[PDB]
């Protein structure tokens, strides 16, 4: 049973680190398009 609870804890924490990694990756992806957006709005200011 002891190996059980330790194993379980390990799995749940594994999944948590997975979710964390997913988040940092997908957020690091969104900042790209946001960056391109900023450049197009400064382009707009030059048009103005």
């Amino acid at each position: 049973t002891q190996f059980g609870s330790t194993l379980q804890n390990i799995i749940e924490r594994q999944d948590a680190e997975a979710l964390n990694a997913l988040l940092q990756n997908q957020a690091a992806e969104l900042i790209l398009t946001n960056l391109s957006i900023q450049d197009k709005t400064i382009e707009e200011l030059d048009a103005e």
């Binding site: 957006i37 709005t41 707009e44």
Partner: protein, 48 residues
């Protein structure tokens, strides 16, 4: 003689207004690019 001058002065005025028209429609034309830039920008937004 005076008749003549009237026409000339009028011509001058027309010239004035013609420029105001051209300049106006240059201004407006430029605005189109500006709006178009924002278009591109919001386009990218949907992509995000």
């Amino acid at each position: 003689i005076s008749q003549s001058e009237t026409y000339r002065r009028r011509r001058q005025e027309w010239e004035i207004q013609r420029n105001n028209a051209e300049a106006e429609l240059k201004q407006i034309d430029a605005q189109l690019k500006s709006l178009a830039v924002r278009r591109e920008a919001a386009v990218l937004q949907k992509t995000s």
